[PDB]
């Protein structure tokens, strides 16, 4: 019954939205926030009001807009401005007051009511009473309250509520008990009207129902002497648990204030004041603490703070810091700690060993703040470094088992190392210089290593950053005896689990030329071999076949060692990966690319020595002979010609005649044409012809690729499906499908000539970003996540990609719609070329015209429209859309930080059941797409028109922008984690190749990229000199993503008009 209730709204909204499409009136705009509210979708409705502001300043007192936005502090100082210019206006006065009640400014709300009482007409007076009652309640003026409560009718739920509160002050129980049950039904029947306040009083009825159950808990407290601890516990649990905003919680505590004073209840009121501080209502947070101190608004401003309650003072200090007065805050802290250690050492009689411990914990927190603040005021330099480290190590002592404490100490040492390094690079731009530096770096390196180790063991599960840092120090400096010792020590101490997280980063250094670092890497990998070998066999197998010799040597040494306990798993992994590389690119496809290349080098470039280097591995490949039926059937129809083509090539080698070499090419092009004709005649592959060894595979102990994790039972490769569908790209991926030992099937894209190492580390980054979103409460509340897939490299060319189910590319969905609707698929393109045959060569101005022409003669609604017709009902349509908007904004922001280029309509897809978005292909990363020569990107992410359309109407103001902020806020907070991960691949020795392609040392280049990322994560990504806060930077980006001047410049294939 309630299930079918939202369906009606969801369907009504769809048409109501399409009505806004027809003509945006205030008539639709009003009847759209309302339906969005009943649909319990608050942030999407918030966007409707944003549009209402930005187009219709027509229900505008600027203070009514600030009121509707719940921006009470702006609305108050706007209602001041409007009032002192005009007269007394009984409308503005109530407006002015509503701000003061939602600010919880009872001091003035009671004042301003009594300051104007002849000017209260019987309309104005009726509203007046309700607010001046809570104002009196907030000031414990029960005389004033009762006089105002005698003014509010018993018919209003509000009236009946304030009677319940007044009887409870006066200890009348059965009176108040009735008043509650009557205030319920006068609100039960109230919300049936639904027209007064449809959500801010429906969520605010949950305020009242909470308050009315809490008032029934208060009636229990003042009447049952044994439910003291029990009620207080449910009061405390549903406080760390319960999330209700500042304003609501003023009221919630006011109920409890009847029964418990703040002094008996410090942990509650501090947590409350913590939240007022966290949300940014500082002057309110202050007033709470002031009350708890039993002294001090900052009034005796020159005096010491009172130690009286050490816990309260500490909060006050960080409030003061969070205010403006932060030199002051730093000073009061330095002194507070000095007091605390003396109140420990000397005042400890041995009986107080709980009080010693909690006090020692407080100090650790103070010591951390001191270090944090010192850096904020002074930065990192010669004078601050030893002082902060002192504060940090102090914190280390007082709470030996605190992650934060150990982390901060580690980081400070690490940044001390960096400070001196970066100082020395600065020195060299302009003997004893190195020797002092050696001792300086070592001084801070060993501690940093130790710190990061103790912090790693204090995390466990969440420590990617700390782990990666340990590797930075290891790979950078771990060949100095002292540093090495610390590492060996640490490696022993830390659980082995840790390193799995970091396996690709380690393997990347298998071949380290430094001997001391090499040893420990091999040592470690061997031990990660012993326990959970699954996590190593695929990557080690990749490494063991490597043109770079020292890589493959050292890989095999580990696999040798792994055989002595896991032999037939190693053997299986060896074989399965061999056969997959064979299947990835068949013998003829290898010959195809190798003859494009050799014809470019010889004919198109005049290079026989290059040409010879291309063909020689291919001829030598076949010199081993056919191994599969498909290898023979090739070798049959072509082999004869090729062996003889090589013959003529080697006749030239000793003669030099072009006529010896043209007879070779005459043979080469025979097979080349022949291959090309047969190429789109591979739409399927059969495992019995292509790799028999794989068909044969039954019940292996090798895990299904990238399914191993230690928490969960091993899914092994039970059997491989005998047929591989070949997707017809220019790369031609095979659709490989394995049966798991668990029952379920597992589908992969087996890819030839596609370096998947990049996508691998990118998938890693999403992992972390996923963690941080699961961890930030708001982000969890909204289910913000990245859809990721398995990435299993197999060599430089090849590798497997997890096939995500139920997804179709943007392109596919549009193709299908346009054909179904008999629209020519490529209509904008054809429109554009008809108008301007030279489109790509036009001035920006000229381009914009043609772009605009195309857009204005085509429907932008395709994606929106298809997503509607797809859905089996309207409430499923709605959720899918909520999901869509959210998931797209997640990847907008993350994508932007990563610098993820090339987001054309085949490179993002949509899961047709949830509506969530998926990015594939992480080739173009960092600014790469934008820095290129021909068709550079101007876009920070695709916020293309059909995407926008497919949102709600008011989309960009709604969920999209709000989600954008949230994601970005998470990113900026956790910048260090994100930077650790990126730095890991930017400085990865094997992956530096992506940024020398700006041509069509790298040390220098790498630095740039990372700066660019740091910039983005601090809002210094537009102006060097301004530091933009989140909502500003997001707004700049949406602006940028959306600029026609930008979009018209995109390579046509990217489809700027989609």
């Amino acid at each position: 019954e309630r299930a079918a209730k939202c369906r009606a709204y969801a369907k009504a909204l769809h048409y109501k939205e399409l009505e806004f499409q027809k003509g945006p009136t205030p008539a639709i705009l009003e009847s759209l926030i309302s339906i969005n509210n009943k649909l319990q979708q608050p942030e999407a409705a918030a966007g409707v009001l944003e549009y209402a502001m930005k187009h219709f300043g027509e229900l505008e007192i600027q203070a009514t807009w600030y009121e509707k936005l719940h921006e009470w502090e702006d609305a108050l100082v706007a209602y001041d401005k409007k009032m002192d210019t005009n007269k007394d206006d009984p409308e503005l006065m109530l407006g002015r007051m509503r701000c003061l009640e939602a600010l919880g400014e009872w001091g003035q709300l009671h004042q301003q009511c009594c300051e104007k009482w002849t000017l209260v007409n019987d309309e104005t007076q009726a509203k007046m009473a309700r607010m001046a009652a809570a104002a009196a309640w907030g000031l414990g003026q029960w005389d004033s309250m009762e006089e105002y409560t005698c003014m509010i009718p018993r018919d209003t739920h509000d009236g009946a509520f304030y009677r319940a509160v007044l009887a409870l002050h006066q200890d009348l129980f059965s009176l108040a008990q009735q008043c509650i049950d009557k205030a319920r039904d006068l609100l039960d029947a109230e919300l049936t009207a639904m027209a007064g306040e449809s959500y801010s009083r429906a969520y605010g009825a949950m305020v009242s129902c909470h308050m009315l159950s809490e008032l029934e808990e208060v009636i229990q407290y003042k009447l049952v002497p044994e439910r003291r601890e029990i009620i207080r516990q449910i009061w405390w649990e549903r406080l760390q648990g319960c999330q209700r905003i500042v304003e609501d919680w003023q009221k919630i505590l006011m109920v409890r204030s009847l029964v418990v004073s703040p002094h008996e209840d410090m942990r509650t009121w501090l947590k409350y004041a913590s939240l007022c501080g966290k949300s940014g209502r500082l002057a309110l947070a202050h007033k709470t603490l002031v009350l708890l101190l039993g002294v001090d608004p900052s009034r005796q401003l020159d005096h010491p703070l009172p130690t009286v309650h050490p816990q309260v003072t500490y909060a006050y200090m960080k409030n003061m810091w969070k205010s403006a007065r932060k030199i002051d805050a730093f000073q009061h802290m330095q002194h507070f700690v000095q007091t605390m250690q003396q109140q420990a050492q000397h005042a400890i009689a041995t009986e107080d060993q709980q009080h010693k411990q909690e006090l020692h914990k407080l100090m650790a927190r103070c010591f951390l703040k001191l270090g944090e603040w010192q850096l904020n005021l002074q930065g990192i330099n010669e004078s601050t470094i030893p002082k902060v480290l002192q504060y940090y190590s102090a914190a280390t002592e007082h709470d030996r088992s605190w992650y934060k404490a150990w982390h901060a100490w580690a980081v400070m040492n690490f940044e001390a190392v960096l400070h001196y390094k970066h100082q020395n690079q600065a020195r060299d731009e302009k003997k004893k210089v190195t020797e002092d530096l050696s001792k300086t770096l070592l001084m801070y390196t060993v501690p940093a290593v130790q710190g990061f180790f103790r912090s790693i063991s204090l995390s466990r599960g969440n420590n990617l950053q700390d782990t990666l840092r340990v590797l930075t120090l290891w790979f950078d400096y771990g060949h100095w005896p002292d540093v090495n010792e610390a590492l060996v020590e640490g490696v022993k101490a830390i659980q082995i689990d840790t390193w799995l997280q970091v396996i690709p980063q380690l393997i990347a250094r298998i071949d380290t030329p430094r001997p001391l670092v090499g040893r420990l890497i091999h040592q470690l990998l061997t031990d990660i071999g012993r326990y959970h070998p699954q996590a190593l066999i695929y990557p080690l197998t990749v490494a063991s076949k490597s043109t770079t010799t020292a890589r493959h040597n050292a890989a095999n040494k580990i696999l040798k060692n792994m055989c002595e306990h896991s032999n037939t798993l190693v053997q299986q992994a060896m074989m399965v990966s061999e056969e997959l590389i064979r299947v990835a690119i068949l013998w003829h496809e290898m010959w195809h690319e190798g003859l494009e290349e050799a014809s470019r080098l010889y004919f198109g470039e005049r290079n026989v020595k290059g040409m010879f280097e291309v063909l020689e591995p291919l001829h030598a490949m076949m010199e081993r002979g056919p191994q599969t039926l498909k290898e023979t059937s090739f070798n049959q129809a072509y082999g004869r010609d090729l062996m003889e083509a090589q013959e003529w090539c080697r006749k030239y080698m000793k003669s030099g005649n072009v006529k010896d070499l043209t007879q070779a090419w005459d043979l080469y092009y025979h097979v080349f044409r022949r291959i090309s004709k047969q190429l789109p005649q591979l739409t399927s592959l059969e495992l019995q012809y292509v790799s028999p060894k794989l068909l044969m595979c039954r019940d292996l102990e090798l895990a299904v690729p990238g399914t191993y994790d230690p928490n969960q039972p091993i899914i092994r490769i039970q059997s491989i499906a005998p047929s591989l569908q070949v997707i017809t790209s220019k790369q031609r991926p095979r659709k490989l499908t394995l049966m798991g030992s668990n029952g379920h099937e597992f589908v992969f894209l087996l890819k030839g000539h596609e370096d998947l190492r990049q996508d691998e580390r990118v998938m890693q980054l999403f992992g972390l970003v996923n963690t941080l979103l699961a961890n930030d409460p708001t982000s969890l509340r909204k289910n913000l996540s990245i859809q990721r897939y398995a990435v299993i490299p197999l060599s430089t060319n090849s590798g497997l990609i997890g096939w995500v189910p139920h997804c179709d590319t943007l392109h596919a969905l549009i193709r299908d719609y346009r054909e179904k609707k008999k629209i020519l698929l490529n209509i904008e393109h054809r429109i554009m070329l008809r108008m301007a045959p030279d489109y790509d060569h036009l001035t920006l101005m000229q381009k914009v015209e043609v772009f605009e022409h195309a857009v204005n003669n085509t429907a932008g609604d395709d994606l929106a429209k298809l997503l509607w017709l797809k859905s089996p009902s309207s409430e499923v349509w709605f959720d899918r859309r909520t999901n869509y908007t959210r998931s797209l904004a997640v990847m907008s922001m993350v994508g932007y930080i990563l610098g993820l280029g090339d987001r054309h309509p085949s490179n993002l897809m949509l899961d047709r059941l949830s509506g969530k978005i998926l990015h594939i292909d992480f080739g173009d990363c960092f600014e790469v797409a934008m820095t290129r020569e021909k068709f550079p990107e101007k876009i920070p992410f695709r916020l293309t028109r059909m995407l926008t359309n497919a949102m709600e109407v008011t989309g960009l103001d709604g969920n999209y922008r709000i989600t954008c902020h949230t994601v970005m806020e998470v990113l900026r907070e956790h910048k260090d984690s994100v930077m650790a991960v990126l730095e890991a691949f930017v400085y990865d020795p094997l992956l530096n190749w992506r940024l020398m392609d700006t041509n069509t040392a790298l040390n220098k280049k790498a630095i740039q990229i990372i700066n660019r990322v740091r910039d983005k994560l601090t809002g210094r990504d537009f102006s060097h000199d301004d530091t933009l806060d989140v909502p500003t930077q997001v707004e700049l980006l949406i602006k940028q993503a959306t600029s026609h001047e930008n979009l018209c410049q995109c390579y046509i294939g990217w489809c700027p008009f989609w």
Partner: protein, 317 residues
């Protein structure tokens, strides 16, 4: 086709440069301009040839000899050439490139490269030469206007509205006013300080006209100095008077039906000698002759299959 007292020339995306006889609407001749759209057209002061600024070239076709193809090409610059401008003594030609250079070309010499280069930061949308022949006003995409002193090689720069691309700039024959027009749609007007004999040339700002809401594409002063015409993406040419900077006449090509797509942008205008008439370049494939006082459409020039982005107009004795 140069022997005729009036020269009216039209180019755009259809790979032709067409010459019209102004008083009839009949097309005199067409000239093949393949492989690019034409960005700008200017007839040389001495009416000997017309220049076609395009993509990575300036091509120059003869007006005196009827029928051949280009006399002079200029190559080897990259990205578009947006503005052409000529010096009166016919030897110097000026260009503005997307390649962020103002280029002075020796027309009476054979080098395929140019005499001087002034490099700025953004692409240059327009170049025009102060009547005193000693200064090049250069307007770029960053929103800067550079006064290039062709004598000192000193540059001076000026930003009316920051971060917004300035699109065209012009300067009245008498040299009392300079106009610049930007992608916001504003028209900025400056007064000019006649310290010309000793080289000063100050600009003292007079007005910002909110000429349009869409991109302003060109501005031009009547030879009279009575009027300032303004062309826009809003499908309009707005003729402003220099006494009030009030609107006098509006020429438009709007649909007169709110559901018709924008039927073409107003890319260019040239006034007649007497300042009685104005010519109009449009994306609807037509050049138009208007009466300036009435806003009546006196003639329509209809030959091009694709859009028109250019005019050149000429009355000289």
């Amino acid at each position: 086709v140069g022997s005729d007292p009036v020269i009216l020339a039209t180019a755009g995306y259809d790979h032709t440069v067409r010459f019209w006889q102004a008083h009839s609407g009949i097309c005199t001749r067409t000239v093949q301009h393949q492989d690019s759209q034409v960005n700008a057209l200017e007839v040389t002061p001495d009416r000997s040839m017309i220049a076609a600024a395009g993509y990575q070239h300036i091509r120059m076709y003869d007006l005196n000899s009827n029928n051949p193809n280009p006399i002079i090409s200029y190559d080897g610059v990259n990205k578009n050439i947006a503005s052409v401008g000529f010096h009166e003594d016919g030897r110097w030609m000026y260009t503005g490139g997307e390649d962020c250079t103002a280029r002075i070309w020796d027309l009476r010499s054979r080098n395929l490269q140019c005499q001087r280069i002034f490099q700025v930061n953004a692409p240059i949308n327009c170049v025009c030469l102060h009547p005193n022949q000693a200064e090049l006003i250069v307007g770029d995409q960053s929103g800067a206007i550079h006064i290039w002193d062709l004598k000192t090689d000193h540059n001076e720069q000026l930003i009316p509205e920051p971060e917004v691309s300035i699109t065209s700039a012009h300067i009245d024959p008498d040299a009392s006013y300079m106009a610049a027009v930007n992608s916001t749609g504003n028209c900025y007007v400056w007064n000019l300080t006649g310290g010309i004999g000793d080289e000063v040339t100050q600009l003292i700002p007079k007005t910002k006209i909110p000429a349009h809401t869409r991109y302003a594409l060109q501005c031009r002063f009547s030879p009279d100095s009575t009027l300032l015409a303004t062309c826009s993406a809003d499908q309009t040419c707005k003729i402003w008077r220099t006494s009030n900077f009030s609107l006098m006449t509006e020429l438009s090509i709007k649909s007169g039906n709110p559901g018709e797509s924008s039927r073409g942008w107003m890319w260019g205008c040239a006034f007649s000698g007497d300042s009685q008439y104005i010519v109009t370049a449009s994306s609807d494939n037509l050049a138009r002759l208007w009466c300036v006082e009435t806003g009546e459409i006196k003639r329509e020039y209809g030959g091009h299959q694709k859009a028109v982005v250019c005019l050149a107009f000429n009355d000289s004795v």
